[PDB]
PDB file of C-alpha atoms (C1' of nucleotides) in Angstrom:
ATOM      1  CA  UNK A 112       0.000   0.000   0.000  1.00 47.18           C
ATOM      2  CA  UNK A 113       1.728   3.347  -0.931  1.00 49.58           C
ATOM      3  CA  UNK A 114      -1.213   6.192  -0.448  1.00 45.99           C
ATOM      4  CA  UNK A 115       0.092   9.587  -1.846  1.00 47.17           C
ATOM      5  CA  UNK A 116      -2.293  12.886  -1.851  1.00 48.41           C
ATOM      6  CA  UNK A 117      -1.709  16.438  -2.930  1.00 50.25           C
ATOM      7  CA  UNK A 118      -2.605  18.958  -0.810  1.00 50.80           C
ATOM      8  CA  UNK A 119      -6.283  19.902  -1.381  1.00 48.88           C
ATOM      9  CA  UNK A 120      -7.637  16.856  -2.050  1.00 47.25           C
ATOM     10  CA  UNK A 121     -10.855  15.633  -1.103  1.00 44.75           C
ATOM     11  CA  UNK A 122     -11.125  12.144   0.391  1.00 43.49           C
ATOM     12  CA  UNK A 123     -13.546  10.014   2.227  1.00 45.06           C
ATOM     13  CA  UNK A 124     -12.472   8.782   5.020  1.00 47.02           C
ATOM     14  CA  UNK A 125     -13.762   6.631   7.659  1.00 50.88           C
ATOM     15  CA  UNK A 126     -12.191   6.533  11.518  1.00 49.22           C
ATOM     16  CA  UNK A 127     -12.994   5.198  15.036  1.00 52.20           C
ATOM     17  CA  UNK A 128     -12.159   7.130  17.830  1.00 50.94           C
ATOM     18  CA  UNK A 129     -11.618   6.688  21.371  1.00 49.19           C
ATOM     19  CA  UNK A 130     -13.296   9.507  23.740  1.00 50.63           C
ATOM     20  CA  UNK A 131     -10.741   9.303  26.161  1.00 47.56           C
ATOM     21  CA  UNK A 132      -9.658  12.261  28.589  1.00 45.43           C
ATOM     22  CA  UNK A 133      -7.639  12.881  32.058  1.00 45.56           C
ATOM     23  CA  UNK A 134      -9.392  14.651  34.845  1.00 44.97           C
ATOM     24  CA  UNK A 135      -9.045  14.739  38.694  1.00 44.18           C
ATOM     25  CA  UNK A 155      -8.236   9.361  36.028  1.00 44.86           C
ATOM     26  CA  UNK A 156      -9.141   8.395  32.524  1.00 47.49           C
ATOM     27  CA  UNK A 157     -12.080   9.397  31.658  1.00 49.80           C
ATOM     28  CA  UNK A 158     -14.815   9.468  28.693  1.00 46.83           C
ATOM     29  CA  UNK A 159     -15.869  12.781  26.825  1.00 44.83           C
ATOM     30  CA  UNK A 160     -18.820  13.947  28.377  1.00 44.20           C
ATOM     31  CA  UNK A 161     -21.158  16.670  26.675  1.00 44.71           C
ATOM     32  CA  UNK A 162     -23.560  18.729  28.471  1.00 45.43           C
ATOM     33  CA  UNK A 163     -27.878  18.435  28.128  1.00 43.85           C
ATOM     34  CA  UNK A 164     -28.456  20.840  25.209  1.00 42.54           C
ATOM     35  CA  UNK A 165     -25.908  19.262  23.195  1.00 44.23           C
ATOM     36  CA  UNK A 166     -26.185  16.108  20.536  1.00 44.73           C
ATOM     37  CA  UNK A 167     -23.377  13.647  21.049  1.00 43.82           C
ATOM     38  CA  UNK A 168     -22.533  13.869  17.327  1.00 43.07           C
ATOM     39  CA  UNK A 169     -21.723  18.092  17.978  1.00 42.04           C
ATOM     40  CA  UNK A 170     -19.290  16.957  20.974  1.00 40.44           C
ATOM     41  CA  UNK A 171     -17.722  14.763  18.978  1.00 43.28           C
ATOM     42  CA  UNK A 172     -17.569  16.785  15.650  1.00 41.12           C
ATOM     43  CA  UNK A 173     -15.929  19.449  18.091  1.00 40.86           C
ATOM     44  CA  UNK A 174     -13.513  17.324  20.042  1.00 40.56           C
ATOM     45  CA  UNK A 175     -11.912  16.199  16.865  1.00 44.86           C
ATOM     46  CA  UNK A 176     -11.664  19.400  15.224  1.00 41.90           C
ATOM     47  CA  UNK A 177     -10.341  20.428  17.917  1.00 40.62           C
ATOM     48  CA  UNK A 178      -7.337  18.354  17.596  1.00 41.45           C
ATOM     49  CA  UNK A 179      -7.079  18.458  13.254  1.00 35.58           C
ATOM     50  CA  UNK A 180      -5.073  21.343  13.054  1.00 33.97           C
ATOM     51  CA  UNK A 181      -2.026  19.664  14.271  1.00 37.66           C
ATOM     52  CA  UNK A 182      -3.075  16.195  12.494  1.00 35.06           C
ATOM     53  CA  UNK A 183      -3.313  17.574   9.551  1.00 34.02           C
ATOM     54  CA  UNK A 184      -6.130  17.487   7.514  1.00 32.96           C
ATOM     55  CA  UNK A 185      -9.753  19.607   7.703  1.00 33.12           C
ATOM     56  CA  UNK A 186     -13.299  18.263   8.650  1.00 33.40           C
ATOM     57  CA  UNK A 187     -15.552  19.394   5.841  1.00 29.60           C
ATOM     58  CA  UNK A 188     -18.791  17.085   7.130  1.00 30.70           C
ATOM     59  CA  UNK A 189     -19.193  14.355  10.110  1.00 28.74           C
ATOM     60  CA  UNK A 190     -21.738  12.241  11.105  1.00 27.54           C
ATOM     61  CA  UNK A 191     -22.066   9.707  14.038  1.00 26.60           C
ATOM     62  CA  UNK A 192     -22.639   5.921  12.999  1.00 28.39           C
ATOM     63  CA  UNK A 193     -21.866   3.319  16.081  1.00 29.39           C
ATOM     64  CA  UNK A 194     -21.375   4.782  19.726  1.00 31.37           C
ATOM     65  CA  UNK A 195     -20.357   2.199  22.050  1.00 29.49           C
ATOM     66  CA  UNK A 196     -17.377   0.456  24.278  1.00 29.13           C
ATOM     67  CA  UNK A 197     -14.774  -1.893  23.688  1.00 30.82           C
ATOM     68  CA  UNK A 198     -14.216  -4.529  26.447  1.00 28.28           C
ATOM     69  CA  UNK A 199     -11.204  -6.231  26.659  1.00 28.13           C
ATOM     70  CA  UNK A 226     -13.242  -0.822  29.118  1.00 23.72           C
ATOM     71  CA  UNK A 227     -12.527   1.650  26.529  1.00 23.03           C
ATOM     72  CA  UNK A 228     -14.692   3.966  24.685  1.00 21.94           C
ATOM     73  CA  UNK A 229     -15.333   3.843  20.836  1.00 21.12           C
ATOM     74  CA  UNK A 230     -17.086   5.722  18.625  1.00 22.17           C
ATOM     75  CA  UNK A 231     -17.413   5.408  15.089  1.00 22.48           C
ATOM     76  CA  UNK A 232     -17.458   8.757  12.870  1.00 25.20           C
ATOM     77  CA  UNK A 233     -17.578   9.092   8.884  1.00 29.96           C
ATOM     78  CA  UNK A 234     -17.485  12.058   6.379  1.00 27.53           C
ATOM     79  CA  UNK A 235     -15.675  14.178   4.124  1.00 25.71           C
ATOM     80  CA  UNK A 236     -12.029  15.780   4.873  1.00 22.03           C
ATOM     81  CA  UNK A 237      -9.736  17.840   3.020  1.00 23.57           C
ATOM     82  CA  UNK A 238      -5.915  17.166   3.345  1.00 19.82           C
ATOM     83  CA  UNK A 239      -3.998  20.543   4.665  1.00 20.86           C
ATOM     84  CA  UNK A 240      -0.630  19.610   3.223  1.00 21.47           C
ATOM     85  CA  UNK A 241       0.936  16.552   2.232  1.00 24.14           C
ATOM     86  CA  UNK A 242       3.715  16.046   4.507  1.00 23.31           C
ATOM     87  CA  UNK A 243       1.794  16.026   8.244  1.00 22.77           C
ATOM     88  CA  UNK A 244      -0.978  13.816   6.377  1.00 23.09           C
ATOM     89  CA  UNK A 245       1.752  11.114   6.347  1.00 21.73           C
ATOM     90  CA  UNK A 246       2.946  11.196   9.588  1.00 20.65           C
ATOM     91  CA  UNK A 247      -0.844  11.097  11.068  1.00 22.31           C
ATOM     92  CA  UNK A 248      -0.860   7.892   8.769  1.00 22.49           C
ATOM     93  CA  UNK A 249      -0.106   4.193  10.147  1.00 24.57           C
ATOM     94  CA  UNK A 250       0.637   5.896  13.440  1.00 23.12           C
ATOM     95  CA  UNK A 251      -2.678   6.525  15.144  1.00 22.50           C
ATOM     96  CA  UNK A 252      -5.049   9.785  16.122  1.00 21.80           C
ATOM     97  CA  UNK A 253      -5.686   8.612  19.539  1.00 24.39           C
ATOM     98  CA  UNK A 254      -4.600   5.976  22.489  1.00 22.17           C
ATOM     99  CA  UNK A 255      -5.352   2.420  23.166  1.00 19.87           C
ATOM    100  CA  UNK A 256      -3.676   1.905  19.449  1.00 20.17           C
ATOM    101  CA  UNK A 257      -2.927  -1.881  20.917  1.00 21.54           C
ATOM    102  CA  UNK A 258      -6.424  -2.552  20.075  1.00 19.34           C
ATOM    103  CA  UNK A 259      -7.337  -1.376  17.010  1.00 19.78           C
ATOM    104  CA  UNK A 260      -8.393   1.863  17.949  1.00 22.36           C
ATOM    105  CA  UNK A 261      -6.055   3.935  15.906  1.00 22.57           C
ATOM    106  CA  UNK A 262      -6.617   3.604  12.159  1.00 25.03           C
ATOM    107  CA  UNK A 263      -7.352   5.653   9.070  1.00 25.08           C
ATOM    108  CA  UNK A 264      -9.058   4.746   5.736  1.00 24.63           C
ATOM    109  CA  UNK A 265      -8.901   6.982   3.030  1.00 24.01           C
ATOM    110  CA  UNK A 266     -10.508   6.728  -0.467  1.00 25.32           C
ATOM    111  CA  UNK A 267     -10.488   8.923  -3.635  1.00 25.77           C
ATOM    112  CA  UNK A 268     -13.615  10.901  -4.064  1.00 26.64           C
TER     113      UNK A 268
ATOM    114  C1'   G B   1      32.575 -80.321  56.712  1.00 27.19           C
ATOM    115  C1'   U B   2      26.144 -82.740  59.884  1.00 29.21           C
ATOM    116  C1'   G B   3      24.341 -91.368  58.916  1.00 25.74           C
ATOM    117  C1'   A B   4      27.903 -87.013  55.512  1.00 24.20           C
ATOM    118  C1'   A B   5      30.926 -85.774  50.854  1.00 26.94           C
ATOM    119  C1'   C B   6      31.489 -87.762  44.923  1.00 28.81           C
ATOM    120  C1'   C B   7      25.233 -88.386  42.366  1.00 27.07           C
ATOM    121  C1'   G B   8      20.924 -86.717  35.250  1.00 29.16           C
ATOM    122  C1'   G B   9      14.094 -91.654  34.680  1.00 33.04           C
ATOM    123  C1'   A B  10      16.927 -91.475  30.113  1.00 29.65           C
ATOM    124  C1'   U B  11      15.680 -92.520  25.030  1.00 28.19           C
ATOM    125  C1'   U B  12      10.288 -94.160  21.053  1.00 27.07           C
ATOM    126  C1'   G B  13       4.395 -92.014  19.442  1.00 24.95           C
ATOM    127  C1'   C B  14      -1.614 -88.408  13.549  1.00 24.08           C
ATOM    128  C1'   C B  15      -7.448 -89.137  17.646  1.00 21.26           C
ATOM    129  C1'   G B  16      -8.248 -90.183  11.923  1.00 21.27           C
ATOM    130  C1'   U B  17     -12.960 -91.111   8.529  1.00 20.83           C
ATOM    131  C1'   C B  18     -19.959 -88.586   9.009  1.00 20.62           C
ATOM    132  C1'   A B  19     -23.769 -84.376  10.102  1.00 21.42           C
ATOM    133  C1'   G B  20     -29.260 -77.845   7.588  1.00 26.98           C
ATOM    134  C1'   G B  21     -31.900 -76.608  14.313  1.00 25.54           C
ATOM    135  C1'   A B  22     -36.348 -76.327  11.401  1.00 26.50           C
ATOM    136  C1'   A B  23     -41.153 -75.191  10.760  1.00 27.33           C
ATOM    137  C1'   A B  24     -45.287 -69.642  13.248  1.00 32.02           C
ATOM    138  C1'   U B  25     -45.742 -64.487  15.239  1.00 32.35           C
ATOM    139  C1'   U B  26     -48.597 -55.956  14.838  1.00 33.87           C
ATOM    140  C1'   A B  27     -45.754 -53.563  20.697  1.00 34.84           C
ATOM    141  C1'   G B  28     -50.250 -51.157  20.139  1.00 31.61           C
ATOM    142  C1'   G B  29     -53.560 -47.812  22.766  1.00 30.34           C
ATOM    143  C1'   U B  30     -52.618 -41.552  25.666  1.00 30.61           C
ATOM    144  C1'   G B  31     -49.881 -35.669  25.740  1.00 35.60           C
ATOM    145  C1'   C B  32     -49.100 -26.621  24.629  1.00 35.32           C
ATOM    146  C1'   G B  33     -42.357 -26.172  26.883  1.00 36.76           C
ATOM    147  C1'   C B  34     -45.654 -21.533  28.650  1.00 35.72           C
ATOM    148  C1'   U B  35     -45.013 -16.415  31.414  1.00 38.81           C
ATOM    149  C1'   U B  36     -39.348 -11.769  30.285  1.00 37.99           C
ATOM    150  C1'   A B  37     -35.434  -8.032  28.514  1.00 38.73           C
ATOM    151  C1'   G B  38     -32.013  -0.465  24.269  1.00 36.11           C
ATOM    152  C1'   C B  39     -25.091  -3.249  22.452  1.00 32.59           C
ATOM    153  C1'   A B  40     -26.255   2.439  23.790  1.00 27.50           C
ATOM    154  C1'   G B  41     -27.917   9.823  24.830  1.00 30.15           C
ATOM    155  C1'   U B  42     -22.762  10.003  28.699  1.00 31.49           C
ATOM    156  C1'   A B  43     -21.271  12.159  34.524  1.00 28.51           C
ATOM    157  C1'   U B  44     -14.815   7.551  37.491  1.00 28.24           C
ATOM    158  C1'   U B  45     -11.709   3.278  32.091  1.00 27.70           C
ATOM    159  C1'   C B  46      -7.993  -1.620  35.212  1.00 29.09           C
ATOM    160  C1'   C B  47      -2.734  -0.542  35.494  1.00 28.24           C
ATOM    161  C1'   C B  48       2.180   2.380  34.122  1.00 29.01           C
ATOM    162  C1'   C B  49       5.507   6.795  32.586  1.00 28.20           C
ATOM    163  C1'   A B  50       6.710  11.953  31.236  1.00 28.27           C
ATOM    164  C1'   C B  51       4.810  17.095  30.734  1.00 28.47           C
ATOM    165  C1'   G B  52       1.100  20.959  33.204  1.00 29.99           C
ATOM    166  C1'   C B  53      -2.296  22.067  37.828  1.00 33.78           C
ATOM    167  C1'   U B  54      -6.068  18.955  30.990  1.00 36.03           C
ATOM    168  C1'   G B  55      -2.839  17.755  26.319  1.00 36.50           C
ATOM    169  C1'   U B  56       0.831  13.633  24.377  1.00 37.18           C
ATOM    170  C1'   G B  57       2.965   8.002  25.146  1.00 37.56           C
ATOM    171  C1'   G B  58       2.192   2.285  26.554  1.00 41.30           C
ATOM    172  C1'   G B  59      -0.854  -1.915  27.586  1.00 42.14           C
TER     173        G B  59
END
RNA sequence: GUGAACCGGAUUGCCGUCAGGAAAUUAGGUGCGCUUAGCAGUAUUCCCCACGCUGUGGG
């Protein structure tokens, strides 16, 4: 597999994450009452493209539910555009998030 | 080293010719496995390390 992209491409990619934060502990992502979990999510992981690399265009919620083994996992699917071409790769094959021992960390991207 | 010491029951042999267990039998009559439940809209994720007073890294 050898995946190369320009920078501004569109691609359709397809990603589980793990909700997984530190507090005073690790804990889940929590959202508040007048918020969908889909928005918390959308936000949380925008939050953190900038330094991955690459820019949420559209981002829906499919399958939100745990991993025992207990981890949280959510699955998320949409439409991003690459920011450049050289950060891209190094977010590649190396994981967006922990527990990347099981099979939490992993990208798919197709042509669109 | 004792009424003891020295000391072989040994050689020779086919049980062989013959035989239908056979004619006759239904195991049949009786039965609800039935009352019950989001793999998901959350309020601590089991353990370890570094960096701050939540963000990275491993199982």
């Amino acid at each position: 597999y050898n995946p190369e992209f320009k920078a501004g491409q569109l691609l359709r990619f397809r990603l589980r994450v793990n909700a997984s934060v530190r507090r005073h502990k690790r804990v889940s992502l929590t959202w508040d009452a007048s918020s969908t979990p889909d928005q918390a999510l959308a936000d949380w992981l925008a939050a953190k493209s900038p330094k991955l690399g690459f820019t949420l265009q559209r981002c829906e919620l499919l399958q939100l539910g745990w991993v025992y083994g207990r981890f949280r996992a959510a699955l998320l699917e949409g439409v991003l555009e690459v920011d450049d071409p050289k950060l891209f790769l190094k977010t590649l094959s190396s994981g967006i998030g922990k527990a990347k021992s099981f099979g939490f960390g992993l990208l798919s991207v197709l042509p669109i």
